[PDB]
Amino acid sequence: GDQICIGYHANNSTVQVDTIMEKNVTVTHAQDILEKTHNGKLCSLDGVKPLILRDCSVAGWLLGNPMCDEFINVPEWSYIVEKASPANDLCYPGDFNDYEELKHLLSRINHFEKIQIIPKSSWPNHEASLGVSSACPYLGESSFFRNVVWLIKKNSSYPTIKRSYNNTNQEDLLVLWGIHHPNDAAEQIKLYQNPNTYISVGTSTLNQRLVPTIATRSKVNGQSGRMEFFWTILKPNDAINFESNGNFIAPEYAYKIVKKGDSAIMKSELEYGNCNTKCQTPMGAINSSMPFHNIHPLTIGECPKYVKSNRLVLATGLRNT
Amino acid sequence: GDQICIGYHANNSTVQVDTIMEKNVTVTHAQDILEKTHNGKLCSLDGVKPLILRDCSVAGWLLGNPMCDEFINVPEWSYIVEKASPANDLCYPGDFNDYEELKHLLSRINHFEKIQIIPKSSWPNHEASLGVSSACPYLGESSFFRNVVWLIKKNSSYPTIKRSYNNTNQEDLLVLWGIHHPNDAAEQIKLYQNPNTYISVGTSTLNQRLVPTIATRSKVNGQSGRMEFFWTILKPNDAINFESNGNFIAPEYAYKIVKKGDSAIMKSELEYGNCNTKCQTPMGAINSSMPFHNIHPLTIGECPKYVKSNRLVLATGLRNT
Amino acid sequence: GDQICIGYHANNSTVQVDTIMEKNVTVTHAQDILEKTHNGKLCSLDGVKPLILRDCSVAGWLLGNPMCDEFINVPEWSYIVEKASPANDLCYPGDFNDYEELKHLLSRINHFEKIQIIPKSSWPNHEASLGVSSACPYLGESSFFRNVVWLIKKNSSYPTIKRSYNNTNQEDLLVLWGIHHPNDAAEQIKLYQNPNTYISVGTSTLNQRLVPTIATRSKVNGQSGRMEFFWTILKPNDAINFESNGNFIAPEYAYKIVKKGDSAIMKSELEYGNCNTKCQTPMGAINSSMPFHNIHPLTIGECPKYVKSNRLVLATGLRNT
Amino acid sequence: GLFGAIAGFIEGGWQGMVDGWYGYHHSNEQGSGYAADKESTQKAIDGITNKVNSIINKMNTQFEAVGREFSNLERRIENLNKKMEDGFLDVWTYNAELLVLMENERTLDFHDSNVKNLYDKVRLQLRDNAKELGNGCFEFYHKCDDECMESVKNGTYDYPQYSEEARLNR
Amino acid sequence: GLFGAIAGFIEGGWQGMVDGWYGYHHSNEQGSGYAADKESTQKAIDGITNKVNSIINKMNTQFEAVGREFSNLERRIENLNKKMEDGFLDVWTYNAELLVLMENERTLDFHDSNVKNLYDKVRLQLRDNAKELGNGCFEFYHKCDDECMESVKNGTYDYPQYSEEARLNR
Amino acid sequence: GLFGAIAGFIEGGWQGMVDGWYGYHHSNEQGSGYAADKESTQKAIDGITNKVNSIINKMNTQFEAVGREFSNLERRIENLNKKMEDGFLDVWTYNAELLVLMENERTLDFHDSNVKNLYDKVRLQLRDNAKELGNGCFEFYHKCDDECMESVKNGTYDYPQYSEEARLNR
Ligand SMILES: *[C@@H]1O[C@H](CO)[C@@H](O[C@@H]2O[C@H](CO)[C@@H](O)[C@H](O)[C@H]2NC(C)=O)[C@H](O)[C@H]1NC(C)=O
Ligand SMILES: *[C@@H]1O[C@H](CO)[C@@H](O[C@@H]2O[C@H](CO)[C@@H](O)[C@H](O)[C@H]2NC(C)=O)[C@H](O)[C@H]1NC(C)=O
Ligand SMILES: *[C@@H]1O[C@H](CO)[C@@H](O[C@@H]2O[C@H](CO)[C@@H](O)[C@H](O)[C@H]2NC(C)=O)[C@H](O)[C@H]1NC(C)=O
Ligand SMILES: *[C@@H]1O[C@H](CO)[C@@H](O)[C@H](O)[C@H]1NC(C)=O
Ligand SMILES: *[C@@H]1O[C@H](CO)[C@@H](O)[C@H](O)[C@H]1NC(C)=O
C-alpha cells in the first residue's frame, strides 16, 4: 500500500522567542528587531561635523571666555556637544540671564557668524582696556571675556553713554551685554566714579533698566563682585540703544545667525570620532536597518525607535523539533 | 441520493478592510468609524453664539482699542475665536503683563459685564482727556484705549493720586491699569511734571510698586514710548488702592465676571457661520454619530475622539467571494 | 459495547468575567487582580511615622507660626501630611517667595535639625523683642513667627546692619529671612527711622537687593502691612551676608538637612492612624498582594499599579455549565 | 482561513443566501433552496455588535487636547507642551489603528470558525447515513424529507431511523 | 466556542470530574468513573500561570503619578501637569482593561482547543475499532479493559490487537 | 498547539524537507522523497512578511524624546518634563514588547493552522480510497502514481477512478 504524509519543517536552529503563554520557545526562523550596538564615537552627521565644546560651556563660548579661544570662530555644525560639567564657564563669577532659553534657541541653529558691532577702540570718553581680572587669566596674565568690554572711568570720570546699533544685516543678531555688581560702594566709585548708576536698553520689543545691586558676597574664583549677562535677538533693520552712567559691560562682538535648521545640544563626555553617521546618540553612532534600538533615548538623525528592552525577537518560523 | 450543504454568504459589496496579515481584504459587511467631513463654518454651540474677534486680539478687546468698538459690549459666548495674527492689538506699543495667563482664565469664562469703576470726569486735579496718541487713531483723529485713562498733569503740576475702589458687586472683577514709559526725561517732565514717579497698587493679595523705566527705543506705530498693562481679579468686598505721582494709566471700566463655565479660545481664520452645532473645530463644525474623527485635535463640545488616521474601517462581515 | 468519553470540568462557581465578544461570562475559575480596599488610616511607612501637620501649613511650620509649636522640633518622617486649606499659615499677612519650589525640595527631605544661627540677644544696636503683632497672637498676647526676628529701631535710630553667617556644618542649611512692607511712609519712619531702606543678601550663588514697597492695602488679619519671606540653601563652608538699614526680618533659627531620601507631601484630611504599612494613599493604607488597585493615584511606597477600573478579573478556568 | 472553512473546503460563498450569514441549501425530490441557520447567525450577530461597542467604549477615556499659549520667553515649555500633546495623540492613534487591525483579523476567523462549527454540527449528526464529498456537502445514503432536513438543522435529526436504509444502501 | 468542543459537541461539563480540568469517564464491565487527563491539564496550568505573570510583569513599567504644586499665576502649567498625569492614567487604564479583555477571550478558546485536541487524540487512536456518537463519546466495537482504557489515555493504545474483533463485529 | 498539528498528531518536523515550511513526503514503488507544498508555503510567507512590516510601520508614529534644560529654580517642571518623557518611553516600550509577544504566539498557531489545513486538504480528497493512520500519513487502498501523488498535492486528485480498487481492496 502506497502512502502519503503531511509534514512540516525542522532544523538545527536554536534561537528562542517568547510568547504570552510560553517563553524560550525554540523556533525555526526568527527576526531580531533590536539594534544593541554602536561605534562609540561622535561622528559627523551626514558629512556635517558636530561642534564639540571640549571643556567649555555654551556660556564660555558665546561670551568668549579666554580659555575658550578654540571656538573664537566656529564652522557650521550638525549638532553641538557639551560636557556634563564643563570646567570653563563664567570665569568672572555671576549669572547668565535666561540661559536655558538660549540653549533651547541653539538647538535650532546650525551656524553663527561673529561680527564686530561696537569696536573696542570707539570709546574715547572711557577706558576700554582696563578691563581685566585675575579671575579670567590668559597665558598667566589678567584677561576677560572677549566678546564684551568692561568699560571703566577715564581721567576720573564716567560720562553717560548713549550708544545705538542698527542691525543692517539680512539676518537676526544674537546680542550680549552685561552689568557689574561691585562688593562695596567704594569699589563702585573707584571703578565708575558715579555712585548711583544704571543701564537702560531698548529695541522695538525690549525695554530694560538695570541697576547694579551691591552686596557682600563670598569669593568665587577669588572675586566678591559679580557679572550678570543678558541677551536678545535683534531683527534685521531694528536697532538697540544703550544708556548707562556706570557698571556697563558693553557688547563688542555679536553673532549673525547664518544658518537655521535641525540641531541639538548633546550632553556627552566623548569627543570627535572622525567618522560619518546617519544616527548619533550620546554614546556613539548607530548604523542599522533595525526598526528598534536600545542605546539611549536622546538621539539625532534618521534613527530606529528607542525602546528599553533587553531583547526583541520576532518569531517568523514554526516551533522547532 | 438527497444532499445537504453547509454554505456561507457573499454579495456584490466591494469595501476593503485591513488586518495584520492582509490589507485590502474585500469583506461582505464593514463599518466605517472615522468621520472625515465638516461644514466649514463657526457655529453657535448648542444655541450659544461664539464671540468672533474679527481683526482684534484679546488684548485689543479688553483694553478697548478704538479699532475694536464692535466688542465694546459683548453678549455671552460659547467660545471665543481669535485670528493667528490679529491686526489690532496694542495700538500704542508696549506689553501686556502675564497675557497668556489671562487668556487661560478666559477659556473658563462665558460672560463679562463692563462697568465703570472710576469715571473719567472724576479727575479734578489732573487732565483726564489729553490723553490721546496718533498711534491710536479713531476716525482720523488721535485716540486711545477706551477702558483706561492716560492722565496728564494739570496747570503745570501732577499731585499724588491716592484712589481706591471697593468691589461692592456679587462677582469677581477683572481690573486693568498701566504705566507709561517715556523716551526721555524731558518728555517725562513735560507729561507728568514730576521727574521721579511711581505707581503703587494694593489689594488683599496684591502689592505692587511700578517705576517708569526710561530708555531710547525704536519707533513702533510711530512711538518710542511704551505702555505696560497689568491686571488682577478683585474679589467681592475687596478694594484696590492706587498711588502715583506720574505715569499712571488709570482704570475707567472693568469687567464683571457674570458667567463662568466651559469655554475655549479657538484660533481660526473663519468667521460666524450662522448655524448650530454640538461639536466645533477650528475648521468647521461636525455632526456625526461616528466614534472617531480626523478633522483637528483642538475641538469644543460633544465630540468623537480625534485620531490621525486616513481611514478606520471595522470588518463586520466575512470574506467576500 | 464499552464506551469512553472526552469531557471537561464544571462546578457551582458563579463569578463572571468579560471578554471582547461577551460580558458576564460565568467561568469555573477566575483571578481578581484589583485591590479595592484600604484601612482608612495614615500609618507609619515601614516603621517611620509621617509628619502630620494638623492645622498648620508648611509655611506655618518652617517660619514658626506661634500656632504651630507642636512642630517646633520634628522627628524624622517618612512623608509629610498637610490639609487642603490649613488654618495656620502666614499669621501676619504676606507672601512666601518661591513657595512651591520649596515644597518640592521637601518631598526629597526626611529630616531637619533646627539650629540657632543668629541669637536674638545679639542685636545691641537695635530692638530685637518688639517685635510682635496682634495678627500673630500666642496665648492671648501679641506674638510673631518664632524662627525670624522683626528688628525695630533702638533709642530712635536704626544703624545699618552688616551681618554674616558661615555654614560650618557638614550639611546644607535651609535659611529663611524677610522684609516688611509698611502701609505708609510715616509708619516706615516710626518703625525703622530711615525712610529709604534696603536689604542686600549674598552668598556664593545668591545676590539680592530688597526694597520695601509701600502701598495702601486692604486689611488681612487686621493688618495693612505685609511680610515677604525668602529662603535659600546654604552649602557647607559657604556664608550668607546681610545688609540693611530698615525693614529687615532677620533669621534666628535655620534648618540642618540631616536626612535626605524618598519623601512626599501628601494632601489628606486624615491624621495619624497608629499603624504600619508598606503602601499609603491619601485615603488610607493598602496591604495587598494584588498587582492593581483603584484607591487613589498619588500613593507612597511599595504599591500595586493604579488603574481607574471598577473591576479587573482574569478568567483562569473554562466556561461553566 | 485559520479554520479552513471560508475560502477553504467551501471554496465559494452563496449570492442567493440572503436570509443570513451562514446556513443551508437542501436539495431533495420536493424542491431545493437556501435557508439561513438563524441560531449560528444570531450567535455571530450578538458577538460582532458587542465587539463594536466594546471598541467604542474603551476609547471613551481618550486624551482630549487643550490649547495653551506661551510667550516668546516660554519656548521650552511651549515645546514640552507640544511634544506632550502630540505624544498622547500618536499613542491613542496607534491604539485605535492597532485594535481595529487585530479585531478585524479576529473577526474573520470567527466567521470561519462558525461555518466550520456549523459544518461539523451536521456531520456529527449524520454519521454514516451520509457521504462526505468534502466540498461542503453531505449526500444521504437514504432519502431525506423536507422535515428530515429541518431536523438536521434543528439539531434533532434522528439517527436510529434511517440507520437501516443507509447501512443496506452501500 | 471557536473550536466547538466546550458548550459545543460536548454540551455539558462534569461536576464529578474534580481531579482536573479536562479528562475521561470510562465505562466498562469492571466499573466506570472519572479520571483527569493530567498531561493536558498540566499543559493548561503551565500556560495560564505564565499568562498571569506575563500580564503582571508587563505592567511593572507603569506610570506612577507625582504631586506637584503651582501658584495662582502658574495656572497654565498646573493645567498641563494635570492633563499630562490624567492622560498617562487613562492610557495605562485602557491598557490593563483591554489586555485582560483580550486575554480572557483567548483563555477560554485555549480550554476549548485543549478539550478538542484531547478528543481528537483518542479519536485518531481508536480509528474504526470504535463508534463515534459525536457527543463526546466513543463506543468500542470490541470490549475494553480497564488497562486498555488507560492505554488510550496514555497514548499507547494498541490498534493491531482488537483490529480483529472490531472489524468482525460489524 | 491550538490546532494540534505541529508537535501534535504530527509529533515531529522534517529535517530533510528543505524546500519549504510545510509539505509532503510520498512513498510509492517508484521512489520516495520530500516535496514542499508551494501554495501553502507561499501563503504563509506573504502573511508573515506583511506582519513584520505592519509591526514596523505602526511604530513609525512613536514618541521621540527631546533634551530640555532647567535651572535650579525650575525643579518642578524639570521633574514634570522628566516624568513626562520617561512615561512615553515606558508606554511605547510596553507596546512593542506586548505586540511582539502577542503576534509571536499568533504566528505559531498560524503555522499550526496551515499544517492542519494542508492535512485536511488531502484527507477530504482521498475519502475512503485511503487509510488514516492518524500520525500525519495516508495509506492508499489502491496504488498511487507519482503523477497521482502530485494530483493530490495539486488539488485535482481523481476520486472517481480508484473508487473501485480501493472499495474492493478491503
Ligand atoms: C535701521 O536702519 C534701517 C535702514 O536705514 C532703517 O530703515 C527704515 O524703514 C525702511 C526699512 O526698509 C527704510 O527704507 C527707511 O529708510 C528707514 N526709515 C528711516 C526714517 O530712516 C531702520 O529704521 C533703522 N532702525 C532703527 C531702529 O532706527
Ligand atoms: C468693601 O466694602 C465692604 C462693604 O462695605 C466692606 O465690608 C467689611 O466686612 C463686612 C463684609 O461683609 C462688612 O459687613 C463690614 O461692614 C465691612 N467692614 C467695615 C469696617 O466696614 C469691606 O471691608 C470693604 N473692603 C475694603 C478693602 O475696605
Ligand atoms: C566658611 O568657613 C570656612 C572654614 O573656616 C572657610 O573655609 C576656606 O577654604 C577652606 C575650606 O575647607 C578652609 O580650609 C580655609 O581655611 C578657608 N579659607 C580662608 C581664607 O579662611 C570658608 O571660606 C568660609 N566661607 C566664607 C564664605 O567665608
Ligand atoms: C554599516 O557601516 C559599515 C561601515 O561603513 C558598512 O560597511 C556597512 O555596509 C553598513 N551597513 C549598513 C546596513 O548601513
Ligand atoms: C446632521 O445635521 C443635518 C442638518 O441639520 C440633519 O439633517 C441630520 O439629520 C443630522 N444627522 C445627525 C446624525 O445628527
Ligand SMILES: *[C@@H]1O[C@H](CO)[C@@H](O)[C@H](O)[C@H]1NC(C)=O
Ligand atoms: C495584611 O495585614 C494583616 C494585618 O497585619 C495581616 O494579618 C495579613 O496577614 C496581611 N496580609 C498580607 C497579604 O500582607
